[PDB]
Structure 1
Amino acid sequence: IVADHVASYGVNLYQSYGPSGQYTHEFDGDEQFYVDLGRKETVWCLPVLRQFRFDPQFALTNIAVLKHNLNSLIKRSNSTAATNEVPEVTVFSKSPVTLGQPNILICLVDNIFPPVVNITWLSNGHSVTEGVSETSFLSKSDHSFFKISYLTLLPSAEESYDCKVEHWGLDKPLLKHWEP
């Protein structure tokens, strides 16, 4: 559909493995907020949006409808499960890489399905836990997902970085390299 603005109010997700769910709202491809279903908390992604209120119970109640609708569909489709997809990984910096100045590495894992994945960072072949954040599963018109991970860093002339992606559609954990 061709339109000036595309909004999702919202994106409802429930899957059997876990089991896990996700409730988000999107406007023009960006996440407005998500509901921590385990905490019954609304977490806005734009500070300007903190002024609004959103009942997390709606998300919980909506997700419950998805679980009931799923079990119906699992049987009726003769147990047709999800096809594992090959995710595409791209690593880039948030700003131009000026040495000695803080920056953020951005790892875009696109074409994710099913929405199950670890995204982790590596520096010189070592696990990097601090400074790592990530978005939710953002929707796509083909009904796959993409997730973006962030790694804050002070780039230097010798420290290399790898974005690591483990996925079922992946025979081996995928590694996308980045160097200043």
Structure 2
Amino acid sequence: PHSMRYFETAVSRPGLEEPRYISVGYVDNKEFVRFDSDAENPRYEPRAPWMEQEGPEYWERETQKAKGQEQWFRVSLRNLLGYYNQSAGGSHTLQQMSGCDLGSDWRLLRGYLQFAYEGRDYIALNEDLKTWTAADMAAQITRRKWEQSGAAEHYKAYLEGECVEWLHRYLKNGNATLLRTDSPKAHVTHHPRSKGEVTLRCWALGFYPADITLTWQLNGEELTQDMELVETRPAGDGTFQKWASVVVPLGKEQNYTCRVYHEGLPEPLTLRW
């Protein structure tokens, strides 16, 4: 299973002159290129070691694509002010997500192309890559305009062609870096507490990718309501961390078991205190 994404953003701010445009590319959810208009010599920069294979002709072209998108966002931002009857002197955001999903047969599984204004969904290309979805009354002007121009055919071509073909190319070029999954190393810690109770905190550390599930069991059935957890969080080194806890009678603690479900594991982990 594989994917590519470009996550594009432009933000305007009161008083300033031109919006700031940032684009970020991801292969299999890991960052691999970046462009940022604030930089001294704005360019698409490599963002993993495996991308340094790519020659000068590659960066030059990608860089001109970015400058083009910058101009596209500029104008779009301007039109949006108009559509929403927003005056001057505020801050606005326009974001885009696009890319493609491949199954393990390396064939195109799904295409994505969606837009948000002020962090709210504005318009998106449906799964069929032929029809558009736009909720806001203000978005209808765009959707009619786009329906009558064959915008969807343009995007369809990209998503079915270059997206796929170039993801293919990238995947071959970085086999040793992007085929890894680090398994979690788990453990349970003991925190004494009020009223003859204790907190059992189940840790999972050094794992990649980030998706993971931790469940507590009272000798069999799970405990959904009484549980406490944290949002999965980066360690800073490329791996991730997460815990989940439940409150338990002192002494009567061994009939609680913690289960860790991660990808990259031979089978779910099972731990107690």
Give the TM-score normalised by the residue count of structure 1. 0.52
Does structure 1 retain, via aligned residues, the 8 Å contact 2:27–2:167? no
Q: Which runs of 5+ in 2 are unaligned?
A: 1-23, 30-90, 101-111, 113-162
- Say whether residues 1:101 and 2:196 are aligned partners: yes
Q: 1:136 aligns with which of 231, 237, 250?
A: 231
Q: Secondary structure at the match of 1:77?
A: helix
Structure with greater helix share of residues? 2
User: What is the match of residue 86 of structure 1?
Assistant: 183
In 1, Cα distance between equivalents of 2:266 and 2:189? 24
For 2:249, give the aligned amino acid. P
RMSD over aligned CA atoms reads 3.6
Q: Which has the higher contact order (CA 8 A, sep 6+)?
A: 1
In 2, Cα distance between equivalents of 1:76 and 1:157? 58
- Say whether residues 1:155 and 2:252 are aligned partners: no
**How far off is 1:147 after superposition?**
0.8
In 2, Cα distance between equivalents of 1:145 and 1:66? 25
In 1, Cα distance between equivalents of 2:205 and 2:27? 19
In 2, Cα distance between equivalents of 1:66 and 1:97? 49
**How far off is 1:158 after superposition?**
3.0
In 2, Cα distance between equivalents of 1:61 and 1:147? 29
Give deviations 1:92-120, integer Å, cap 9, x for gaps.
12x3367x533322111001111121110
In 2, Cα distance between equivalents of 1:144 and 1:176? 21
Q: Where does structure 1 differ by over 3 angstroms across 4 or more consecutive aligned residues?
A: 14-17, 64-68, 71-76, 79-82
- Say if 1:154 and 1:167 are closer, same or farther in 2 by CA, change over 3 A: closer
Give deviations 1:35-75, integer Å, cap 9, x for gaps.
xxxxxxxxxxxxxxxxxxxx9x97x948x48999xx69844
In 2, Cα distance between equivalents of 1:166 and 1:144? 16
For 1:168, give the aligned amino acid. E
Q: Which runs of 5+ in 1 are unaligned?
A: 1-11, 18-54
Give the TM-score normalised by the residue count of structure 2. 0.36
Larger radius of gyration: 2
**How far off is 1:163 after superposition?**
1.2
In 1, Cα distance between equivalents of 2:167 and 2:198? 45
**How far off is 1:82 after superposition?**
4.3
- Say if 1:157 and 1:121 are closer, same or farther in 2 by CA, change over 3 A: same
**How far off is 1:132 after superposition?**
1.3
In 2, Cα distance between equivalents of 1:104 and 1:61? 42
In 2, Cα distance between equivalents of 1:112 and 1:82? 14
Aligned residues: 121
